[PDB]
Structures are given as structure tokens and as C-alpha cells.
Amino acid sequence: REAIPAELLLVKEDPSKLPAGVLQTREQLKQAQRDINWAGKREQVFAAVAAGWHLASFALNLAFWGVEGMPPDRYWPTSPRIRLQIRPGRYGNMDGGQRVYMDYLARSEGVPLN
Amino acid sequence: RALLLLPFSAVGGAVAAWQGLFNSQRYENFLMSEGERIWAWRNRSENERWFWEVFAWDRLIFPILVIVAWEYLVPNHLVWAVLAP
């Protein structure tokens, strides 16, 4: 079983014959580590900020929740047919339309009867 | 022994306390006070609401915007700058 002494396995590098500026100082190593750490999370941080803005808007809507705390508005009734002036007239309305209206209203209310 | 670590119960207790803050007589009193303030402010204003709901866009800002936009778009022609608008 071979031994291979460490003088044939280790690098005898002397930090004197190196060119000037090659040997990194502690401040340069700290700056490089900070840059690596920022580059390893920059896109994640920006995507999290955008998603956090969207989540803040959604949480504001959740705090709005329902209708409570809001007055009724005469400029904005809850029905667009009230807001505009839309009425059925002589052309279009037919007797069977009452049956179809009944079926659509049953489906919209959520009952399976017709 | 201690299963209390990773406190999902403690992070849900914030939502539980948030739900318990409302649906109380204090929140009902606050809502009725806000209704009183809304009623007072709605009786006070009565003009600014019509200005902001009817006048401000349709009869103040939108005609200005479409006239400026048309004059910025169409060529320097008598028909396109005067007669057609």
C-alpha cells in the first residue's frame, strides 16, 4: 500500500512571488462575500417585494370584507339597470320569455327546479 | 416532550384575536359612530360629491383632454383642426 508523502501532494505556494494585487486582502474578501450573498438572493428579494405588494392589496380588500361601514349611494345603486335607463319594450318581450326568465332566475338563485 | 415548537397555534392566535376584536359591542358602537360621521359629512358636502361624480371628468377634464389630444394628433390642416372637430 503506497504512501505518497505530502511533499508530493501539497502546494508550496509562497505569497511573495505573486504579482501585486493578486493576494486578496480581508476587506476585499469581505466585499466579495457580500456581493456573492446579495447576488444569491436579489431576484428572490425583488419577486418577494412585488408579491408582497399584491398581497398587501389583497389583505386591504380582505379588511374591507363586505358591505358594512359603507353608506348607500344615490349615484351608485347596486343595479346597473337602475344606474342606466334600460327597460324592456314592445319588441323582444314574449310570453315564453317569462318561463325562460323563471328558469334563469332559478339557476341564478341556485335552485335545481327548472 | 415539548410539541409547542414551530408555533402554528401562536401565528393563528393573531387571526383569532383579530376576529375577536370585531363582532363586539365596541365595534358596533364604532360602526354607528362612523355612520353618524358619514351622515354629517354627507350633509355638509353635497356639492363636492356632485362635482366629483358628475362634473369633474365628463364636463371639465375629458373635453379638455380630447380637444388637446385631437389637436396634438391631427395634421396642421384647416379641416382637421377646426371644421372636423
Binding site: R83, L84, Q85 | V54, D58
Partner: peptide, 6 residues
């Protein structure tokens, strides 16, 4: 003009 405006 418009009825709902007034």
C-alpha cells in the same frame, strides 16, 4: 343632458 346626472 342626462337625467341621472341631476
Amino acid at each position: 343632458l342626462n337625467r341621472w346626472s341631476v
